[PDB]
Amino acid sequence: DVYCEVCEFLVKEVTKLIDNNKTEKEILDAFDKMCSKLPKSLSEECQEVVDTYGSSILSILLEEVSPELVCSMLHLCS
């Protein structure tokens, strides 16, 4: 309800990049600018999530697992 919020944030943003035809390389690189979207309170936690979870989020999304389930699958939400 903290690492969960940043996790829901990232999932959506990555599925936007998926829906806009970004290669996987391009999304890994778009992780640095993603946490810029957020206020400073959250940024640090955000970069903690990108660092351990980012590419695992992307891969699961790329397996066609529902965006909805990603964060709880990874034990960041729920």
Side-chain angles (χ1 to χ4, degrees), residues 5-23:
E5 159 184 67
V6 155
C7 185
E8 312 271 62
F9 177 77
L10 297 162
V11 153
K12 278 166 193 152
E13 290 283 298
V14 166
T15 160
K16 228 302 201 193
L17 295 163
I18 288 174
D19 303 356
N20 290 58
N21 311 302
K22 302 278 168 263
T23 60

Side-chain angles (χ1 to χ4, degrees), residues 13-76:
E13 290 283 298
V14 166
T15 160
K16 228 302 201 193
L17 295 163
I18 288 174
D19 303 356
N20 290 58
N21 311 302
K22 302 278 168 263
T23 60
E24 193 181 331
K25 180 51 174 158
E26 278 152 11
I27 307 193
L28 297 167
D29 287 331
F31 279 137
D32 25 289
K33 147 216 66 47
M34 287 196 61
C35 296
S36 252
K37 269 265 298 142
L38 308 163
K40 276 180 197 154
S41 348
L42 284 187
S43 286
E44 172 170 39
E45 279 77 19
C46 181
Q47 191 94 257
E48 151 155 51
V49 176
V50 175
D51 263 287
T52 327
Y53 299 91
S55 62
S56 297
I57 290 174
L58 177 63
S59 299
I60 295 167
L61 289 174
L62 290 185
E63 299 303 298
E64 262 87 68
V65 183
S66 176
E68 283 181 283
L69 309 175
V70 175
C71 283
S72 88
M73 204 156 313
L74 294 178
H75 294 97
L76 295 155

